[PDB]
Design a protein around this ligand. Structure first.
Ligand SMILES: */C=N\c1ccc([N+](=O)[O-])cc1
Ligand SMILES: */C=N\c1ccc([N+](=O)[O-])cc1
Ligand SMILES: [Cl-]
Ligand SMILES: [Cl-]
Lengths: 226, 226
């Protein structure tokens, strides 16, 4: 059985996780784990309560590890236990992946040094201090590292992983079973296509979080410099 | 506060729910409820454990009700308690919505009689016995009823509901905050675009479920005829 693990942490953006989870759980001969320090409830940023299934110590060696984003990444970027677990699993994983601000966690773990990567548009300036080569694309692949942006990026890259782990016909069958053919009613999903007034409102709402995240990023970068 | 409720039932397709939940929970002055017969754990078809927040009896009058799909709809189509709750809430709701096979539950409740509606492609033949006018489109709107197909339909229609409940700039801001700009790596999300061999594999895998669902549909239609 292919072993796929998602890190599930307090204040996660749950869709970053639940999207790819439902796709990958559709595949044959896969086991999906929701990993935290202990099994039990974990509350997402929206208040939705999820359940971690395994601890760091009990988690089997993973073939795929996926780091979701969300408000809670700031704490994770300075959690030595979580960072050590991610480094241990990434050493042997076939695929290391992240969604949204999850790539900042990979950065704090040292896994982006010299690698092309992306993250959520409002936090993109934080990739370079973590050693990454920042790339403004929706999905960025550097070796076995995939980083993606947007709330379907984990769905979109899960279909890519299905095609490589199995075959293209399997990925297409899953897409058809899920009738996945998105058609958003607006075209404001990127700062390059949204109206300028909307971009301003979004940047203003993220300003305090960005300010705090920069402080955290500099401390995380200092640990990598040692 | 706008009151938004999702029905959460055993064997739900969790992405049908967790997608729109995260979008709508991003809006100001909204309260989101996860409704079942009692608060507590409810297991999705993938094994993911979710938590219902309120019971039928305690649920406030809803402005929006959303019925997700999944394997578990077959039981729901003959659950008199659930069907009565849906009818009660739909009477005064501003928006009645469903995703995927959730529209079959609306059908069993009598809410599709004379209405245009869609459902998952493999079960589309079951709409007519429930009194609906079947429509082969991804999102179908008939008055205050919206039915959608596909794993982002609830995300896509949640942005539409944000624009009507608030304004277009608010919906665009949420889309930008979530960086929602899908780009699937394959184009097999409809039986009209997938390879014929893939369509066959998907239809074969759904055959037993369709056969059972037809029996259930005929019993549900008999109750509507009375
Ligand atoms: C609504 N969930 C759902 C997903 C897939 C299928 N299917 O037949 O493949 C049915 C319902
Ligand atoms: C990855 N989740 C996430 C969603 C939105 C924002 N934002 O700044 O709006 C950041 C992170
Ligand atoms: Cl996206
Ligand atoms: Cl879709």
């Amino acid at each position: 059985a292919v072993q796929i693990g998602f890190l599930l942490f307090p204040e996660v953006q749950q869709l970053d996780l639940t999207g790819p989870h439902d796709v990958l759980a559709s595949l044959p001969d896969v086991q999906v784990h929701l990993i935290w320090k202990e099994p039990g409830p974990v509350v997402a940023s929206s208040g939705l309560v999820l359940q971690a299934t395994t601890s760091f110590a009990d988690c089997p060696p993973l073939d795929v590890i996926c780091i979701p984003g969300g408000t809670g990444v700031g704490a994770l970027m300075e959690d030595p236990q979580a960072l050590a677990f991610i480094r241990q699993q990434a050493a042997r994983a076939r695929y290391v992946t992240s969604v949204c601000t999850g790539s900042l966690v990979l950065g704090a773990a040292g896994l982006l040094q010299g690698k092309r990567a992306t993250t959520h548009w409002a936090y993109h300036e934080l990739l370079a201090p973590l050693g990454a080569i920042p790339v403004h694309e929706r999905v960025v692949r550097d070796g076995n590292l995939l980083t993606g942006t947007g709330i379907t990026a984990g769905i979109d890259f899960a279909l890519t992983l299905a095609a490589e782990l199995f075959d293209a016909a399997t990925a297409q069958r899953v897409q058809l079973q899920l009738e996945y053919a998105p058609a958003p009613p607006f075209n404001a999903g990127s700062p390059d296509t949204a109206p300028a007034s909307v971009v301003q409102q979004a940047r203003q709402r993220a300003a305090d979080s960005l300010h705090k995240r920069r402080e955290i990023t500099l401390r995380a970068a200092a640990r990598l410099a040692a």
